[PDB]
Amino acid sequence: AAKDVKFGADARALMLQGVDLLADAVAVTMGPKGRTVIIEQSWGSPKVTKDGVTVAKSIDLKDKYKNIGAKLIQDVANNTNEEAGDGTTTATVLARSIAKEGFEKISKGANPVEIRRGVMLAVDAVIAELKKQSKPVTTPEEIAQVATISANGDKEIGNIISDAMKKVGRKGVITVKDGKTLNDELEIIEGMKFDRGYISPYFINTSKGQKCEFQDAYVLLSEKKISSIQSIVPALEIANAHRKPLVIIAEDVDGEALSTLVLNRLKVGLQVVAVKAPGFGDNRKNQLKDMAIATGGAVFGEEGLTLNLEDVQPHDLGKVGEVIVTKDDAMLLKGKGDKAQIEKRIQEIIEQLDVTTSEYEKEKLNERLAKLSDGVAVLKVGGTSDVEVNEKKDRVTDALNATRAAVEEGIVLGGGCALLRCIPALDSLTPANEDQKIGIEIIKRTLKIPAMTIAKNAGVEGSLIVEKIMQSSSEVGYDAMAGDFVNMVEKGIIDPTKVVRTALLDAAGVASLLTTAEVVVTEIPK
Amino acid sequence: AAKDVKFGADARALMLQGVDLLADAVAVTMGPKGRTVIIEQSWGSPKVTKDGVTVAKSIDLKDKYKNIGAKLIQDVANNTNEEAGDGTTTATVLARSIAKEGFEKISKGANPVEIRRGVMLAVDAVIAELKKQSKPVTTPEEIAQVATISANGDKEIGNIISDAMKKVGRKGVITVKDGKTLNDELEIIEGMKFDRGYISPYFINTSKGQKCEFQDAYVLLSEKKISSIQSIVPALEIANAHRKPLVIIAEDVDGEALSTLVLNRLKVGLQVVAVKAPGFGDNRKNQLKDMAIATGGAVFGEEGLTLNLEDVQPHDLGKVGEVIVTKDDAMLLKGKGDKAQIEKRIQEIIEQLDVTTSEYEKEKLNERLAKLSDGVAVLKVGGTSDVEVNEKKDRVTDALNATRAAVEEGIVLGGGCALLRCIPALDSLTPANEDQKIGIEIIKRTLKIPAMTIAKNAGVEGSLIVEKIMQSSSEVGYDAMAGDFVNMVEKGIIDPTKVVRTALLDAAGVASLLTTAEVVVTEIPK
Amino acid sequence: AAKDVKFGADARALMLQGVDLLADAVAVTMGPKGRTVIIEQSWGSPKVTKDGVTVAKSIDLKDKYKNIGAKLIQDVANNTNEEAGDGTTTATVLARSIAKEGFEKISKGANPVEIRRGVMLAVDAVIAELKKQSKPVTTPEEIAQVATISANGDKEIGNIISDAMKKVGRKGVITVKDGKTLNDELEIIEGMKFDRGYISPYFINTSKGQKCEFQDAYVLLSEKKISSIQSIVPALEIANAHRKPLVIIAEDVDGEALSTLVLNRLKVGLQVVAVKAPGFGDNRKNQLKDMAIATGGAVFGEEGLTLNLEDVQPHDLGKVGEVIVTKDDAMLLKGKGDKAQIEKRIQEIIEQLDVTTSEYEKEKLNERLAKLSDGVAVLKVGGTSDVEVNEKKDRVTDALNATRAAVEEGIVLGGGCALLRCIPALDSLTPANEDQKIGIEIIKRTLKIPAMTIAKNAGVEGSLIVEKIMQSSSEVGYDAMAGDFVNMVEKGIIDPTKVVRTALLDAAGVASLLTTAEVVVTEIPK
């Protein structure tokens, strides 16, 4: 393919136009009063949504240079906000304004690097101030209050969340399931969690929410790679002989092993999924041992007695009541196994903790201890019929994720005030020269955009609401639902500091790249 | 696919044009004097019709933005009014004018949300007034009068309907069949009805009226999902060994089970249909067991006695004389089974009713009681030839549906007067501000359109007929057939309140979306 | 295919346009302050890079004559600078300006040959001066300092490199691996190395880094050509019977043998690679014998007892724990064999070395001695997880190559000053005539470009930094990171003389061709 190369301002100007279309398209859905977007679909009815991520993903421009500006933001704003959709539109709107102000100052003669440095300095002053203003959420009462708020007043949802937190701890694991009954309930079960997901999107099942779930599954464990290794079929034969799903945990999967598993998933309907091994080095081996004991299987490794995938017996695979695999996250719940062996391993880990002195080993040993001694909290959602249970299920999950985020980093005044109230942090920030000063001034002004954007979607002047907030006491913001100026702490209108902090850092990151890149290379269409 | 994004008024103006063509096309078929529409067909003669639903479905615009305006109404008006052909046209015509008046006020500077709120307030005042003006239809004489009226003077039809209603109750089940004889007759037979239809349009058979009917069929029951579960073939093998159709009732059907069943239906002619299970939780388990007894089969579940789909015997499938599956509805008539077992379960349900105190359980227990002890009324339509029986059959089903609707919610003056006479409901309705006032005024004016449209199709000025109705007593409306002002109660010109109530709510719903959506995204054609 | 033939300046001018686009595209990435280039990719996100080689390879222009100007440089600058990414950009930028200045002087009437001669004379004066200014790196402390510098302050990398050099010598072999542990360590293993790579790019495996790696492989050795000769299958049959990769070392591979090997690699996944034999004449026979002893196989020779390729037995192929083949390089580690035979061969080589007096034989014979008695150093890189280990791995290989280059030829002041400080070398250089004088002046001016280009990317005037450097003491240059004029020796900012020397020679080479070629022939596009 032949290329077409553009230089300097000529390329930057086009990428910036790609950004303006995208930012305007999703800015409109921001806040309590966001408006809808209608997305045409080719097979059925138009989709009508308020979701900032859906709208951002839907837009794809035909122009080769504007397409890049749009992807530079889409590949970050839609990818760094997996837990909640709140940070995507904030990062998109801030990145557009930072980049635009930078572009104008640079095309008039400011130095691209010195402007970038002034912006970084201002962003760090703001982040430190957000950390200073954030309040912790660790007390069971504090947790319940936040959970009730993120549950939008549904006190019963806030209460089952608080109870789950109390039962497994602030750092424990809480999941949500359909209870097949009328009442909501909390059950604690045995199981393991590790940060490794599916190796491929082709294994997605039950596609709403991009999940992959199996029950009564076999578990194949290995400390070795199966990349370009065949003869994985004997394990697949057992899964077919005894109609059970199979999950494969291996150091890596590629080549023929990958091809075999994906094609069977897609063309045969064989219920098999592969997941990467949970650790590194010696700790990888130790985690596989705990896992094998907990699931009642064996690890087909080389150390000690060598086991080969050429010969897999029904007693070599483990058994797990429920297996969940999602992007970068997997769980094994209700495993089968010998309780004497599990308790023995637990006692060994405790002795290892008592004996070792290294911080590294103690921390890893504590995680392995917890994997066998702690349980998993499950929130069972009930209701009259599945049509309604299915919606409540999401209300509970969103409340749960919001609660956990608040507990991990603390909370700040919401509705755009967390950043609006950090503007004074820049008053003591001193630049080395005029271009650094301009860079600080750019952030000082873009800190006002989230607050004005919400006021604009509400239907009132942005310039008046934002200035009036700043002129009042520290706990007063503007409530777009109430249509007035209220004490946000008393009202309970809060945002996790985690989200505010990330959205600003990501916006600054992309805008910086966008205004300093010098050469852009695109393909010539034919 | 590349996209083309339009904003604000530029997108709204195009959707509105798509709507005007659609509304004008179906407005002309409204009322006793509707005119015809000729629809070109590619395989034969042109179709000539007066049906508002057919015309609405037929129109499909080529422009990408006008196409959306047309679908926003078609996807609601043609789908929420499946019971009668009256509500679709009324909702289309009202939505067009509500949205247009809103658009004009908004483009001149009114606030989109405050206008929307004024409209909602006006709609609720009108609905409450319709409820106040509606009269009940519960007395056998009242029922017979409505049935005669909706039967257009066919007193014999009105009488077989009244008699069926009396025998199975106002809330009982009545169906219509070809009697293969000269006289009309009413027969009561054993059978059951539940609100679950086919899972897929690809199972439609006997396509006139979009039905799906089998006789002497096997019935397969399961408490468990068969999504991506195969080995359902032994049931099909029995069905092929003994040439009988098969109906599958399961919690869900997906993956390979679904693929096999649909593809064989379409490419082989496999006579099979699948239906979603009728309940939730404990109610699902109890309904499947009582159903198995009623059909003489077994439930292929895991709890209690385990029965697996891998092994299907001739005695495990139930047997049904006639099975009917339609959108969101399924019926089984004349099933085979052990009468002693059915009576025993009936007595057990009665004992449960005597013991329980909760309203929830009593209601569900009464639904189960009725499904085993009540019969199904069948209206057999007779005549000298099938070409005439087939026409009378429609008069009976239309009169029957209209009668049932009248009985469930009551009746109002028809011919557009139910809404015209609710205008005073807005005189005491107070807005918070000018934009809410404008929104109230928009509804106050669109309440006159159904009456003007009918008078216009009749051939007289709409503005003069409506003003004369408004200046006269409440019982007086304009009869387009008579060409005069008459007492509508005495003439019997009535409309179920259910229809008037829904058409206004749906019209307000779609128009609201249409005037506040801000961004519209369409695909770029190639 | 029809051709388009252009003459003289008309063709030269078009090639120069292809060159200017390329040179500007990579000039901007030069030095510590290089800016980014965004490269559109056909399916994923845009690639953002600062790498001069990636950018240079990415650009491919559509015009047929501009395409040539771009390839004349790309095929040299990207191919002769495989060791480090520094030489490619410098050679591209210098070639562009040398060729342009030449073209302008020639189109105004200067003689193309006499200008070329003046340029060659100036280049040689500069190279001799670089050799005079370069300092050696041979002392363990000097080596450690260079390694620390090229390691960018990572003292732990600088130290493992120094120690590895001490263990196998300045001329030994050092490689880098992932240690699968937390600590870094140095291990010495048995193995051999020779300068022959894969015969074809089609054999690349594990494509990141363009490598080709096999483990537990069979080794087939032959003194005979297999070009257009098949019957290589018996060795492949053994390799397929016992699932092991096969490496073929032969004088030549072509025709059907090559066709079979490449097509099966591409369509089958046959795990086979072929490499050219390591020697010439008597040296080829002796090296293959030493190799067979080291791998435990046999050599398929035709002299004396003939071993025919038509019949390959399991004991004729050698066995090697690890086989690595890269462009122009091959390595075999941990081979199997009889230690008595290896020591016997070593002793024979020693006796032969003691007896022979010829310089040629002593040198080549001592190389064979070393191939059996010396080992290979391996640097095992550790860390908490593979993600970080994988990045540290690059710091180690880059520091290692930079150190070795410094040790082989010495170091000069970096940052473009090595050439800037050689300008006085031309003051004593006397031309025969005016055109030779012009040619010397062209180099005298292009010697200033590396220094100006870095200053420009830094953001300061090029003309002022470069003149200020020349007016100061010999050890002062401009540090783009510091933003000041510093003592480069004290700061440790150095560049291997090997790189500076090559970049200038290659730049002068291509520019020379580019300005004197007279006729250019291109194909007619369709």
Short mmCIF file of N, CA and C in Angstrom, two decimals, chain A residues 160 163-164 167-168 173-179 184-190 322 333-334 375-381:
data_model
loop_
_atom_site.label_atom_id
_atom_site.label_comp_id
_atom_site.label_asym_id
_atom_site.label_seq_id
_atom_site.Cartn_x
_atom_site.Cartn_y
_atom_site.Cartn_z
N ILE A 160 -27.67 -5.06 51.20
CA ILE A 160 -27.09 -6.37 50.94
C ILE A 160 -25.62 -6.20 50.57
N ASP A 163 -23.63 -5.76 53.84
CA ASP A 163 -23.51 -7.02 54.53
C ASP A 163 -22.47 -7.90 53.85
N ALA A 164 -22.44 -7.93 52.51
CA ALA A 164 -21.41 -8.73 51.86
C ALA A 164 -20.03 -8.21 52.19
N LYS A 167 -18.95 -9.43 55.59
CA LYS A 167 -18.63 -10.85 55.61
C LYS A 167 -17.32 -11.27 54.97
N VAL A 168 -16.90 -10.65 53.86
CA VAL A 168 -15.61 -11.05 53.30
C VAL A 168 -14.53 -9.99 53.37
N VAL A 173 -14.08 -10.68 47.83
CA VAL A 173 -14.71 -10.82 46.53
C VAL A 173 -16.20 -10.90 46.63
N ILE A 174 -16.92 -10.06 45.89
CA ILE A 174 -18.37 -10.08 45.90
C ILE A 174 -18.88 -10.20 44.48
N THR A 175 -19.77 -11.15 44.20
CA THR A 175 -20.33 -11.29 42.86
C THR A 175 -21.86 -11.26 42.89
N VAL A 176 -22.49 -11.10 41.72
CA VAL A 176 -23.95 -11.03 41.66
C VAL A 176 -24.57 -12.11 40.77
N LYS A 177 -25.57 -12.81 41.30
CA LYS A 177 -26.27 -13.89 40.60
C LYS A 177 -27.79 -13.80 40.70
N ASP A 178 -28.48 -14.48 39.78
CA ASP A 178 -29.95 -14.61 39.78
C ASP A 178 -30.36 -15.70 40.76
N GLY A 179 -31.10 -15.32 41.79
CA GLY A 179 -31.50 -16.22 42.87
C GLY A 179 -32.69 -17.13 42.61
N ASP A 184 -34.01 -11.09 47.98
CA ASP A 184 -32.57 -10.98 47.79
C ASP A 184 -31.89 -11.69 48.95
N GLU A 185 -30.76 -12.32 48.70
CA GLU A 185 -30.06 -13.02 49.78
C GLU A 185 -28.56 -13.07 49.64
N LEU A 186 -27.87 -13.14 50.76
CA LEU A 186 -26.42 -13.27 50.79
C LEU A 186 -25.90 -14.64 51.17
N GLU A 187 -25.18 -15.30 50.26
CA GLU A 187 -24.62 -16.65 50.55
C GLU A 187 -23.09 -16.61 50.43
N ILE A 188 -22.37 -17.30 51.32
CA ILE A 188 -20.91 -17.34 51.26
C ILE A 188 -20.46 -18.72 50.82
N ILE A 189 -19.65 -18.78 49.77
CA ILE A 189 -19.19 -20.07 49.27
C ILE A 189 -17.68 -20.13 49.17
N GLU A 190 -17.14 -21.34 48.99
CA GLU A 190 -15.67 -21.51 48.83
C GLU A 190 -15.31 -21.31 47.35
N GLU A 322 -18.68 -24.11 39.26
CA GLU A 322 -18.96 -22.97 38.35
C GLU A 322 -17.66 -22.30 37.88
N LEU A 333 -15.37 -21.30 41.27
CA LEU A 333 -16.25 -21.41 42.42
C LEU A 333 -16.73 -22.83 42.66
N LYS A 334 -16.94 -23.17 43.93
CA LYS A 334 -17.47 -24.48 44.29
C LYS A 334 -16.66 -25.65 43.75
N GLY A 375 -13.71 -17.13 51.85
CA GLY A 375 -14.78 -17.47 50.93
C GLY A 375 -15.07 -16.33 49.98
N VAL A 376 -16.12 -16.51 49.20
CA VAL A 376 -16.61 -15.58 48.19
C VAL A 376 -18.04 -15.20 48.51
N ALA A 377 -18.35 -13.93 48.49
CA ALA A 377 -19.71 -13.53 48.80
C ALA A 377 -20.53 -13.48 47.56
N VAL A 378 -21.71 -14.07 47.59
CA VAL A 378 -22.57 -13.98 46.43
C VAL A 378 -23.89 -13.33 46.77
N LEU A 379 -24.23 -12.31 46.01
CA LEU A 379 -25.48 -11.60 46.14
C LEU A 379 -26.48 -12.16 45.16
N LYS A 380 -27.49 -12.82 45.69
CA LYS A 380 -28.53 -13.43 44.91
C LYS A 380 -29.67 -12.44 44.78
N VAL A 381 -30.02 -12.09 43.56
CA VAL A 381 -31.05 -11.11 43.31
C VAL A 381 -32.36 -11.81 42.97
#
